[PDB]
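Audit log entry. Action: structure prediction of a protein-small molecule complex. Ligand: D6U. The ligand was supplied as SMILES and no pocket hint was given, so placement is left entirely to the predictor. Protonation state taken as written. Sequence taken verbatim from the request; no trimming, no tag removal. Recorded inputs:
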Amino acid sequence: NPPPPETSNPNKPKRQTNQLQYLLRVVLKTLWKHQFAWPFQQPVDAVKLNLPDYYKIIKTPMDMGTIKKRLENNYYWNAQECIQDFNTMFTNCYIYNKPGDDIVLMAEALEKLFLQKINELPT
Ligand SMILES: COc1ccc2c3c1Oc1ccc(OCc4ccccn4)cc1C=C3N(C)C2=O
């Protein structure tokens, strides 16, 4: 396994916005409870999961556990930066797998819910 993505970075400027607070309190914490959230709650453990090719294919890994800790640490400058991490997590799943795979069906459902929730953000 590679090191998991950073959740803090002292030379990166931090910020807290109403939209970033909403991304943690509403968007992430609601998605987290979905029946299909479990594969996305932690970095992929390629040793545990017997996926020795995972990080040969996926070069920008991302997961909701990382995103959660980034939000908690005020790691992001703005909501768009956090949204990009969700999108990277979903696209990684489509890249590493195949259409119709169980894990892909899960990501597709979570992505739809994610889009529903970010359609309207606080001002
Ligand atoms: C062949 O299996 C796959 C195949 C592809 C993918 C994955 C697979 O498997 C997982 C198994 C477990 C797991 O986590 C187990 C767990 C997590 C939380 C609570 C309880 N149990 C996460 C994943 C995440 C995956 N992602 C992102 C994939 O693209």
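Audit: result stored. Residues 38-42, 44, 49, 93, 96-97, 103 surround D6U (CB under 6 Å). Residues 79-96 form the longest helix (18 residues).
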